[PDB]
Amino acid sequence: GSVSSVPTKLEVVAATPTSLLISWDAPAVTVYLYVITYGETGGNSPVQEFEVPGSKSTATISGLKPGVDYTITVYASSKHSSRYASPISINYRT
Amino acid sequence: SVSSVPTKLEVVAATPTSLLISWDAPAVTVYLYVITYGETGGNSPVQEFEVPGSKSTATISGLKPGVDYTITVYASSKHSSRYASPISINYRT
Amino acid sequence: DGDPKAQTGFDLSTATTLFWRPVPVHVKQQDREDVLEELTFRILTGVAKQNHNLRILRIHISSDSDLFFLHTLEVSEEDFQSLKNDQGILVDFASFPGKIISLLEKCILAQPGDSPRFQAVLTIRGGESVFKIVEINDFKQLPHITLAFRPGNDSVVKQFLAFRLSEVKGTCHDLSDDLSRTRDDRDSMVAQLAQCRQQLAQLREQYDKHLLEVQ
Amino acid sequence: DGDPKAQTGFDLSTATTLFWRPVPVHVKQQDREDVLEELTFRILTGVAKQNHNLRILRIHISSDSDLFFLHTLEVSEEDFQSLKNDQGILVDFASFPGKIISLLEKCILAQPGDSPRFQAVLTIRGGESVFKIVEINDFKQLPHITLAFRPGNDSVVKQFLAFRLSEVKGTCHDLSDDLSRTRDDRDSMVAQLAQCRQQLAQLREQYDKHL
């Protein structure tokens, strides 16, 4: 029973105008690492990626513009997946 | 006209294996502090470590539990004095 | 990433991270009893700063508890041929990290009751180290793969210390900000208990006045 | 010495520290405004790993305020003659660090209203730096001594990073103690106001019952 094991429950638990912290329940497969990509929705904002170890279910993003809707994507690195495969995305407006 | 020595040396926090000491600084400008810890009258080599002058506190680790140690702070104060004007305490964990 | 200086050797900017998570491993020292620490591992593939046509694999063993315990392993494609002939490997350079990560996954998911049970062990001889994955069968502890680790170059150690320092400084800064918020909450709660006790004392005075009226 | 390793040069194990304290210094950059930031200094005397008969003086300028900062200066006994002839020094090699420390102390203890007032200024030119202690009298800003600084080898940077990391770890333990104290005190304030409001409501209810 090999689930694709994408991350579930992607949510922003705490948020301040310049920084937010996201938490996700971990997929059932052993996760090698997580690649979190935060970017502004549309516009000329480049997509920014930073890597977090697989054991961590939380992360923090800083440097955000106030009052702007951002798109946050969590890529999971499983055994039978690619570290830019199996993504799940949410949208949040700081 | 001034002590040029440290004044108040006491143990603020203590754990069975390590100790933390705090001292009030002399009025003169302190260049640095040399903290020397050794076992009391025992054949343990005296261990010295250096701390900046801005620090009024320090921490010593690697101690043997239940053994009375002698801790001395040498001040490198003005007038080029070094390993001089010491203040000493004895404390057992 | 980190403080920019002379980085001749492995180009960390062009690095590609493959594996980065804690994994439980037994550590062997002559003086220290063997301790099961989920040492953090990190596997990276990339190219050298001198030449981009040469591929290089990198493995780092770090310790979130004791951050002075760093060990590194670098493998070039030619050294990969040498290692493949020495240990009898059959896969190519590209599939080497995949098999290493598969063995590490077998190590992490090992339950106390499993046959055969895969485990990881690191023997530390001074600055040097030897890491090996073992199979505990009903018969013997047979080694699957044996790897040697060395102290890192001064540059890679510099940048690793810089990364950890940045993370710890950020954590302490966030905690100090929350403590400022807690001090504001303390001030508000103070003022509130003070006003509440003032009101209660006033009501007691009114009750005493009513009792005097009754008498 | 945290994370030690041997490269042929200055033997930090055999080093003797003479001065290590924060010093107020004006920092000047070509594209940036001049800011008075309290930089930490380090003075070291010792011998080289190659030969113990050769003495070497070492000066480190670090910044506990910023995130990463280190500049180094090495003076050999042979180079000291050149520096002494260039800047017109009169003391010997042994008293050179003593006079440097005396000038630095005169600089730190400088009060806003004093003539002459001693000050220290560091000009950063890309990777290199020029440090000079100056005297501002009623007439002019005359330089007492001028010293040149460059970045450092990877080893000294490694040990500086280790020291900074240890300092931040100690601060984090102090911070955990402070957070325990402050949150327990806030909770105490909450629970006491809650008990007081409960008593106030009870007494008001009793007053309504009696009336």
Residue numbers in the entry:
A (entry chain G): -1 to 92
B (entry chain H): 0 to 92
C (entry chain A): 7 to 221
D (entry chain B): 7 to 217
Mind quoting what the paper says about this structure?
Moreover, SAS-6 homodimers can form higher order oligomers through a weaker interaction between two head domains from neighboring homodimers, with a ~40° angle between the two coiled-coil pairs. Here, we developed monobodies against Chlamydomonas reinhardtii SAS-6, characterizing three in detail with X-ray crystallography, atomic force microscopy and cryo-electron microscopy.
Moreover, we reasoned that upon landing on the mica surface, a CrSAS-6_NL helix might display predictable spacing between spokes emanating from the N-terminal head domains depending on which side of the helix they land, with a maximal distance between spokes of 26 nm given the fourfold screw axis. Computational modeling based on the CrSAS-6 crystal structures raises the possibility that a helix with a shallow pitch might be present transiently before ring closure.
